[PDB]
Amino acid sequence: STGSATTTPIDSLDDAYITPVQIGTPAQTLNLDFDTGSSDLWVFSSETTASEVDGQTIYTPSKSTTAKLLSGATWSISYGDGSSSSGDVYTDTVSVGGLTVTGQAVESAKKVSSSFTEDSTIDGLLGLAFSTLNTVSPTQQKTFFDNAKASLDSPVFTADLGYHAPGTYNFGFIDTTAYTGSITYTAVSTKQGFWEWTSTGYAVGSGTFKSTSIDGIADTGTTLLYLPATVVSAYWAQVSGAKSSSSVGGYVFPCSATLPSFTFGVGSARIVIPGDYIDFGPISTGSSSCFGGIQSSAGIGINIFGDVALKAAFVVFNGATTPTLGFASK
Template identity: 50%
Template sequence: MRFSVVACLIAAATASPLTPNSRNTKLQGRAFSIAQVTNAKFDNTETGLDARLYAYIKYNAVLPETLQVALQIGEHVNARYKSLMGRGMNKTRGQTGQVLAFPPRNLDIQYVVPVQIGQPQQTVFLNLDTGSGDLWTFSSETPQSQVQNQVLYSPDASDTSELQEGQSWNIRYGDGSGASGIVYTDRVSLGVTSFDAQAVESATRVSGAFTRDSFSSGILGLGFGRGNTVAPSQVKTYVENILPSLASPLFTSNLLAGRPGNYNFGYISPREHQGEIAYTNVSRQNAYWEISVDGVQVGRQGTFRPAADQLERVVVDTGTTLILVPDELVSEYYAEVRGARFAASWGGFVFPCASAMPDWYFGIGTYRGRVPGEYIRYNQVNDTHCFGGIQSSEGIGFNLFGATLLKAQLAVFDYVDVEGRETPRVGFANKRLLRFD
């Protein structure tokens, strides 16, 4: 299901929004929530194979043999992907952090937020993505042939826009698609916050994958500025710029299955999780919200399996859909699902839709984050079989926790740890799951 977003502003001092152990809280700081609402025009045509391929495209990763075979023999494969056959993708595996966003997809959830740019204000609708460090938008400088009803940002209509001479940006994806352009600074507002000199990347070229999505005008990256594609001088993200004005330097994602969720900035709502929040530090040298995970467990009565060596690199990404982990962990899960098998034409594990699905748990210290089995019943591939929400990460270079997991967890993206050092961390907490519990 696809969602747009409307801003629901929450005063920092109301409803005791900050958790008791919140630190470095500014009582006069800003805090606000952005709630998702359903896009009634959504047309769900994407498959599980599409969702897995998008992850490889996004991170410019090497296509494993299983996906190459699926591209060759799968009659259901979107024609767009046929260009990937035999190319193997870019051998950089995305580890430089230069490919941080990706063409909008159709399946499940797309996060769009109304953002005000310029003076007087112009409202554009941008995708939220923790796997991106860019803020870019269709603009009056985008060729008309590449625009399809997107809302456009017009730098010339803003009294506060300033062209950044010599600065440019260029996002390229593994399938050859991309976007590029020039850079302005301008006043940008989100919720109750604003920043007067935010870098706004104006698109002067976009590929057809973006043009076809008239619902979105671009990306608002929630990743780190060190992964920003602006050159020769990288810029900070919007969230990095507004951190000093927030009541607490963090944001949370509270995604839900089958209904609207929300993002909170500057506070953690105690109503959105159960029990304590388990934190683990991110890798400072990385462009993403990348963490390590200690192990996994299959089923409520299963035995916890230490797997820190296999899950040393896990990127928490609201902009991808599936849980992608090493082959061994994938096989161990589907060994507990009746009738599950690897389907070459789908490039992943499928199973009878009527099969009972065990819960899947990941561990950080003593914490066990639960993903209900029903959430892993991703979507149907035919009248009898379904595609699984846990699949292989082979060839990407790291693992991914996407929306399949994030719908079951409150995720906290925290820029400063409890001692006040500037070491970002990610927190997870279980929550009451509205759809299946």
Template identity: 45%
Template sequence: MKTTIAAIVLAILADGAVVRERVDTAPQAPAPGTNGRSFTLNQVQNKDFQGHDGPMSFLRAHFKYAKKLPDYLSKLVEIDPSFRIKFGLGSQADGQIGTVLADPTPLVDTQYAVEIGIGTPPQHIRLNLDTGSSDFWVFSTDTNPSMVDRQVLYDADKSMTSRFLTGESWIIKYGDNASASGFVYTDRVQIGETYVDTQAVQVAVNLTKDLSSDNFVSGILGMANSAANTVRPTPQRTYIHNIKDNLAQPLFTANLQRQAPGSYNFGYIDDSQYKGTITYTPVEPTFPLWMISTTGYRIAKTSHNERINSIVDTGTSLLLLPETVVSSYYAKVKGSSVHPQLGMRLVPCNADLPDFYLTIGSYRGRVPGSYMNYGRISGNSCFGGMQSSGDLPFSVLGDVFLKAQFVVFDYGNARVGFANKKLYE
């Protein structure tokens, strides 16, 4: 029998959790403040890098978006449960701008982590900044101890500004029946020099063991539209939603790098980080994630016209496209093959991979062939950085694509911008 979130909360309260004063559960807008701030949020460097893990990256995307895993992946998970893992899983100032640095995790380029401060005084915690999610959830001292594996824990009791939201809870279920659930506080959250005094912080109480295996990060910072937030009965606002009206411009940019720290800028666009002009495309207005439509692609010198609905997702590592596109690409790679269990595309590690171009309106985004080698599986066999989206309801423009572009997430105007930049091949 499934344990309800109400039962989880009651059990924790019975075990001695502190009951905090009741506050309004409706999301609150940040208060106004002063103008003129700017900051850089850099990626946090993970010094324990051990190399790419292609299967994990592939499965994370399916766990995140698929309603049900394909049969061949379900069988693989049954054979080896270790494959079950989720990716990562004052007053507000007007005119704020800033930058946040993001770092690759030990499985290089599988996640980009940022360090934020929660509470008063601030507790510094690394999170996965995820444009494919609308939940801000963290490991905490309320998390079942058996599910904690060296994560940094948020402690609401040590914050003078934390408030418990009575009656509010959340649950996220993934495609392999993995899940995370818990309750909600509000607290002061600071990212760079921006902050929100009453940001909803979803603390994980129960989660399946496989979700705790990634201890470089201690939760998710969802940066999609608030409409996809899973808190019930009152969905909560995302961090970007809360600060958008107080930024110099209601946007943030991603300048992710290959095997090196990149950055997120909030409230402004740094002209030195890209070449040429920025081309914007609207996001799907009825969908809460950053969904856009691409109009074609090119492999080497061969162009194709095909409309593809895609999520722009910093929380997914691979580039996941329809099988027709994937087949066309690997047909150009001598010695490419398909993994017999995973169904993933493999390439000879020493192969000269072709460049890939994705057309978005008038923009043509290039992914160098060297970026398409995602990591060794054994011997001279490597995983390809482009894989099939298969049964997913849309394609996913993950970090293999994004780290080769300069990307603008324009929250205020519901659009995404792309520009070319200097690449390190």
């Protein structure tokens, strides 16, 4: 089997991407944030505290003839951005782009933090990291991909995120028309439960490539590119007037600037992030200070190849017995 679904930016800045997901019978379609940096499929629901719902579409398990309470199971998650959610668990039928999993754990939110409530466009998350990170207790549950894997034509999914435009998540096949040149594959460590890999270096604009190993995670659920302070400083030093602002929470730059590109290495291959991808716009409405899309990972504890990086590539998440990551230009 295969599946193919379009993923759409939630706003004009590509802050996140939502993908429609069919849950239950008859189908209830929710727009979920596919997140390769976590492993829980959770939804706003009829059980979510009413004051914490503000415009989201909810899953109502009582209206699904295939929903079953997973007795005694609870979940609770905290994300890198400080947000969180928790609740109980149902199993139900879940389909993405024509690919159906029966018996999928659908984690129903009883509580969500303010950031989730305030984002009316995201109805929940669909985790695509390794199932070892799944938070369901006392019986850990598998991700949608893990459940689907054996039925897929090939044990892979791909992320093809758009810049200010829709893109595609495919399951079970590699669309050879969706990228240019060849896909370069690179080793993955699953030790921390992430799609963790080592970039071979970077360049800023038309500058020379610096060969240096940068361990990080491919994370579709994070907006920005978080890299070591040395690398980030080298980037922003090429933008007149750019500075790190503790009050704002990172590097800002004059909105009048033209940003240089940023290149990262994948083996001997190179992925180029155009300068415009690194512009996250005014820090507040009407400001001439703009927020940068490359930020320091210092004090996160891990480097994160988030959407800013991934949207410059066609990315293969290869879930074979020994997982690997593939990157192609597009």
